[PDB]
Design an enzyme around this catalytic site. Sequence first.
Site, mmCIF file in Angstrom:
data_model
loop_
_atom_site.group_PDB
_atom_site.id
_atom_site.type_symbol
_atom_site.label_atom_id
_atom_site.label_comp_id
_atom_site.label_asym_id
_atom_site.label_seq_id
_atom_site.Cartn_x
_atom_site.Cartn_y
_atom_site.Cartn_z
ATOM 1 N N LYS A 50 27.173 57.886 -65.837
ATOM 2 C CA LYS A 50 25.706 57.929 -65.759
ATOM 3 C C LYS A 50 25.048 57.540 -67.067
ATOM 4 C CE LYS A 50 26.077 59.671 -61.639
ATOM 5 N NZ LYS A 50 26.329 58.546 -60.706
ATOM 6 N N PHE A 91 37.044 58.095 -74.932
ATOM 7 C CA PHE A 91 38.211 58.660 -75.622
ATOM 8 C C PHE A 91 38.576 60.000 -75.028
ATOM 9 C CE2 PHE A 91 38.781 61.269 -79.790
ATOM 10 C CZ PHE A 91 40.138 61.315 -79.710
ATOM 11 N N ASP A 96 41.699 63.859 -71.678
ATOM 12 C CA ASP A 96 41.519 64.985 -70.854
ATOM 13 C C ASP A 96 42.144 64.823 -69.445
ATOM 14 O OD1 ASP A 96 39.217 66.328 -68.689
ATOM 15 O OD2 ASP A 96 39.975 67.680 -70.315
ATOM 16 N N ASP A 100 44.752 67.309 -67.863
ATOM 17 C CA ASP A 100 44.376 68.069 -66.672
ATOM 18 C C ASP A 100 45.029 67.636 -65.403
ATOM 19 O OD1 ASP A 100 42.832 69.559 -68.418
ATOM 20 O OD2 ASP A 100 40.844 68.640 -67.831
ATOM 21 N N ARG A 105 38.382 59.463 -61.581
ATOM 22 C CA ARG A 105 37.332 59.574 -62.586
ATOM 23 C C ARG A 105 36.340 58.446 -62.385
ATOM 24 N NH1 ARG A 105 35.259 63.082 -66.267
ATOM 25 N NH2 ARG A 105 37.367 63.703 -66.895
ATOM 26 N N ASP A 167 40.425 75.708 -74.541
ATOM 27 C CA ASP A 167 40.560 75.426 -73.092
ATOM 28 C C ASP A 167 42.034 75.468 -72.678
ATOM 29 O OD1 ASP A 167 39.124 73.504 -70.591
ATOM 30 O OD2 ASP A 167 41.207 73.004 -71.048
ATOM 31 N N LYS A 193 33.890 72.785 -76.607
ATOM 32 C CA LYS A 193 34.472 71.583 -75.932
ATOM 33 C C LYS A 193 33.475 70.619 -75.391
ATOM 34 C CE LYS A 193 35.436 72.846 -71.129
ATOM 35 N NZ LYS A 193 36.405 72.836 -69.979
ATOM 36 N N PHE A 232 25.354 72.841 -68.874
ATOM 37 C CA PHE A 232 25.926 71.638 -68.344
ATOM 38 C C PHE A 232 27.393 71.840 -67.969
ATOM 39 C CE2 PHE A 232 26.381 67.103 -67.845
ATOM 40 C CZ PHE A 232 27.676 66.828 -68.265
ATOM 41 N N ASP A 236 29.293 71.609 -64.447
ATOM 42 C CA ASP A 236 30.555 70.874 -64.267
ATOM 43 C C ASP A 236 31.654 71.721 -63.584
ATOM 44 O OD1 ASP A 236 32.264 68.517 -64.832
ATOM 45 O OD2 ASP A 236 33.363 70.116 -65.901
ATOM 46 N N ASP A 237 31.738 72.975 -63.964
ATOM 47 C CA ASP A 237 32.715 73.873 -63.361
ATOM 48 C C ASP A 237 32.388 74.160 -61.903
ATOM 49 O OD1 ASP A 237 33.917 73.997 -65.921
ATOM 50 O OD2 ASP A 237 33.362 76.115 -66.222
#
Lengths: 342, 342
Positions: A50, A91, A96, A100, A105, A167, A193, A232, A236-237
């Site tokens: 975005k 990056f 990530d 994860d 993505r 995290d 993070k 934010f 996201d979670d």
Amino acid sequence: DVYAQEKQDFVQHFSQIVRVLTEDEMGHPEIGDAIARLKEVLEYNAIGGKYNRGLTVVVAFRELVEPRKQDADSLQRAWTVGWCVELLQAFFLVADDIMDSSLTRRGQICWYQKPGVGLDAINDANLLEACIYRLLKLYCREQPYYLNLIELFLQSSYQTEIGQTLDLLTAPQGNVDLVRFTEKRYKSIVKYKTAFYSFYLPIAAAMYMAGIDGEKEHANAKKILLEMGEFFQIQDDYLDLFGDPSVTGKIGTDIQDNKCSWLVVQCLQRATPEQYQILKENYGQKEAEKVARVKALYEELDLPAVFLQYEEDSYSHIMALIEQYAAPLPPAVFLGLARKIY
Amino acid sequence: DVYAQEKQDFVQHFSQIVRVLTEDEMGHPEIGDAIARLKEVLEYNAIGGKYNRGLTVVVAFRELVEPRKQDADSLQRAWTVGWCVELLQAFFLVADDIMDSSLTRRGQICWYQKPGVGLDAINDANLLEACIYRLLKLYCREQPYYLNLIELFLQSSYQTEIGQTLDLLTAPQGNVDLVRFTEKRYKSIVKYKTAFYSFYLPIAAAMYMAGIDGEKEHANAKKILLEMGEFFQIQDDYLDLFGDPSVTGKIGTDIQDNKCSWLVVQCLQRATPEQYQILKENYGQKEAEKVARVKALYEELDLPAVFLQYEEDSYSHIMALIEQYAAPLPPAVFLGLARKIY
Ligand SMILES: O=P(O)(O)C(Nc1cncc(-c2ccc(OC3CC3)cc2)c1)P(=O)(O)O
Ligand SMILES: O=P(O)(O)C(Nc1cncc(-c2ccc(OC3CC3)cc2)c1)P(=O)(O)O
Ligand code: NI
Ligand code: NI
Ligand code: NI
Ligand code: NI
Ligand code: NI
Ligand code: NI
């Protein structure tokens, strides 16, 4: 919407970014193939989001620099520094997604999952990071804010990395300990993070470009922006489980990955002993039916409603912080950003 | 030996590095656990090598700074900048060992192979990189060379990353193409992936600290140092197969990993059609018996003898370059470094 209004010129500046990050090395043909990989890496991993973080530099720049000082060249530098934020994000996300075990993505397969890429993506991610400092040098070395920007980017990376460490520490694989997942710990994780680089960094960069370098001004901005960033990351979670992947562009992995998500923290706050045991038995594991039981427990506890109430209270709090702390910056700088994220 | 002579004070400065990279964040207890992981990461991955790259900063500093200017504080800064080079190496090796599927490093299991670490090592590696810039800020921000050092480190990282990209590109997994493995390509790979950061960087850092910032001085130094670095990477490639792992501290993976090693390049230069087919059939694969056939072919072609002859010719060439290009720096700066590596 000032973001949708700056978006097109910003996005078109990308081929100029790609061209200067190739052209700069055409006096060394021996690295041709490496530069070609760099271009693929940029195209795949810096495009398709975005652009909220990079655009925030541009929007803030326009609102903080006196219009008479916004000549062609300064605007180029603002679009470049915006793109630097996006390259930082690129990056971060590449690395990530590997850590994860993510699948998709921005609506396509994660770079590391492409056949032929795999763990070579570790180097690709780092090349994206190096490009930031190459652009800063190429476009900003003569400006009085050059060192402030280099230091801001480096610092923001260090903070973000410390947050990623927390995290990962709080989420050991194969090891269910729900006692670690507290609200205090959650706040620390997301401040580091996410909040610094996604909210403080872009505005601060614009501030520095506008010659606003005072410690108090930066501290006041940061008070608003770190709270915005916490919201934010909560969002996201929430979207990791309850968001539509055709809109988020990615599949959530937080339950499988044993993460200290806002959802699991709210879950623990409300669960009975019986519900605690269910969570314990099913959290942090790859099995689809176990994940589903966790989602069902969160639904049983009305966590979607709890989130909607949270979003309302958070928005009001962020607005109260803007009232307290925005001056002497234009409040529009913060309001436009709040509008994008809420 | 000036290196063995500076080694003890340099190595003892490590707990001071670790202490300042923990102490600096004790005003934020919320990141305690992250800082504790950072300490483990530093201890495991920055200690146990030969310290040649970091020590080169210290040795060169002593030889380039007028003795009256070597006060307590300047020496601290020289040891810190040396340690910055070692942290860069630590960043690089942690990531490289993952990408090369390596087993051991400096006589112990690679960090990523430890139970409980795995791909979380990607973040750990990057934290090591961030520590460089934190140390530079803490110790060198007031010095006239501060920006030169930040830029040198960033540039060296970009060069090294471009070199790693070529290494990985030239070595696709599951895909035997020996036609790619040419001498011209080999030289480019090793210049970028190794020569800049292992040889140019530490001396250049000392040069900048001594106020030697001229473009010609740096270019002359670089002429010597990039050639030294090429030799160093050839030697690393030789030792990957023919070195004793109790001395190298690591197990070689270049054949299994389909690498454009100096050995395979020399092999191709000499092999008959029949020997070419043997190489083709056995290179780039995990099977121990296939790897053994490759090693036997290299032995059949007397590649160990070819390497010993190369080492003699390279040493003579490096010495001739020192004669041409060292002035006005003391030749000892280059000779001491050549002695360590040859
Ligand atoms: O977009 P995602 O939902 O995957 C989020 N991604 C995200 C958010 N905030 C920070 C990072 C980040 C930053 C640096 C990282 O590693 C540094 C060495 C690259 C890894 C991840 C990644 P998260 O995994 O936290 O829910
Ligand atoms: O010590 P090793 O023999 O493993 C050598 N290691 C080495 C030498 N030169 C450069 C690197 C390096 C640098 C950066 C890397 O990745 C950046 C994102 C970290 C990976 C490797 C690693 P190599 O694998 O080339 O034979
Ligand atoms: Ni993620
Ligand atoms: Ni993550
Ligand atoms: Ni997420
Ligand atoms: Ni390696
Ligand atoms: Ni390697
Ligand atoms: Ni090697």
